[PDB]
Ligand SMILES: NC(=O)CC[C@H](NC(=O)[C@@H](N)CCC(N)=O)C(=O)O
């Protein structure tokens with residue numbers, strides 16, 4: 001049986017270590033690779049995966065994983081494995097990211113954005129082979145999110161034998177170009193911006209998928225995606241046009257699943273660029289924007305105007321945080337107070353693809369542009385190919401940039417630290433380039449703290465500190481809609497935002513209306 005998924009854009013590549021977009025993860029880490037541990041689908045409950053069990057030392061600084069035996073690696077034209085998954089695969093996977101003397105560290109540019117943005121290098125002091133089936137992580141300090149971190153895409157396990165061979169053959173880049181995993185699907189063909197083809201991996205260690213061919217039809221226009229869905233040219237699609245939601249609910253070919261998103265959409269201010277280093281200017285740009293008007297016009301009601309980086313469904317949420325008011329007059333006065341009575345010009349980057357937290361960045365940019373103009377700020381809307389967009393914003397080239405997040409592990413650390421820490425400003429996904437000690441003073445002890453109520457207290461104050469400094473314009477938390485042909489059984493919406501096909505089957509017959 002063949003399932004066709006209409007994806008929203010092209011993946012950036014096939015080694016998940018090197019990238020941060022859900023687009024890439026759906027095409028790489030989710031189908032092809034495994035992690036040591038895995039969340040139960042639809043939840044953030046951690047379950048055994050490549051590690052069948054683990055122990056944690058009483059001081060929390062040592063994690064020992066006992067690895068599943070008999071796990072086969074995939075094969076391709078350049079690689080046939082001579083051994084099964086073991087500790088060396090795990091050690092290669094992490095040392096490549098951590099160690100600049102590992103031969104693969106600079107391969108494909110070595111942009112381990114998650115690894116570096118989460119400060120995993122300062123945390124993980126060693127990864128040790130206890131024996132062929134036992135690996136030990138040694139940490140410099142306790143880290144409550146660490147187990148959840150190992151369930152994330154960036155911590156996918158790559159093949160050390162494959163890596164060995166490709167290095168000896170003088171073509172190490174093939175590890176990143178031609179993926180070899182332990183997972184349920186293997187990559188068969190990729191035609192850039194057109195299609196991805198997968199077949200079920202016969203030697204897969206887990207429960208076999210109920211489909212044996214998986215096709216991604218790369219389809220960036222949401223209206224075209226829905227047209228294909230109605231024709232059953234694809235059976236699943238993400239990010240429907242917000243205007244389409246009403247007739248989709250009446251569409252008897254599909255089940256329209258919906259849930260509150262574990263996500264956020266925002267506009268990052270690059271505080272390295274004038275005049276965005278000025279606090280009153282950031283507050284003025286924030287107060288000029290009517291967020292409720294964006295929820296109405298861009299999301300067509302399907303979300304909530306935001307004051308905090310984390311959505312209401314994330315624990316630690318601080319409801320006592322004080323929203324910036326929509327007040328252009330006062331925003332103009334703040335600019336005057338800042339010594340900018342005649343405003344200024346600034347660029348506003350908007351991605352060209354739909355995101356779970358932003359269904360139409362272009363249209364939203366036009367609204368913010370119109371809002372900013374009322375206070376004398378002239379925004380220039382800029383866009384890039386999705387992969388290039390992320391790369392250049394990571395390089396700090398933007399002045400302001402539209403951005404967002406679906407949580408990866410259910411933990412507040414994965415929002416506050418991964419998006420707004422100093423580590424993330426230097427080498428991660430903090431495109432505000434904001435590095436602020438009183439923030440660090442909260443989010444860093446919060447990771448090390450094991451007491452849940454104490455973690456809640458620290459994150460609540462991190463929201464206060466962040467709101468006071470306005471390093472980003474926090475716009476929305478959005479409703480998630482996932483249209484699925486009724487012929488599809490077994491599909492489960494992921495609050496962590498990836499799309500999983502290893503669990504789905506297709507009915508015998510089909511609806512032709
Ligand atoms: N600027 C960035 O690196 C963020 C891009 C953003 N990524 C994510 O939200 C992560 N958490 C991947 C998880 C997911 N999308 O399912 C994106 O738009 O994909």
Ligand SMILES: [Cl-]
Nearest residue numbers: 305306307308
């Ligand atoms: Cl909020």
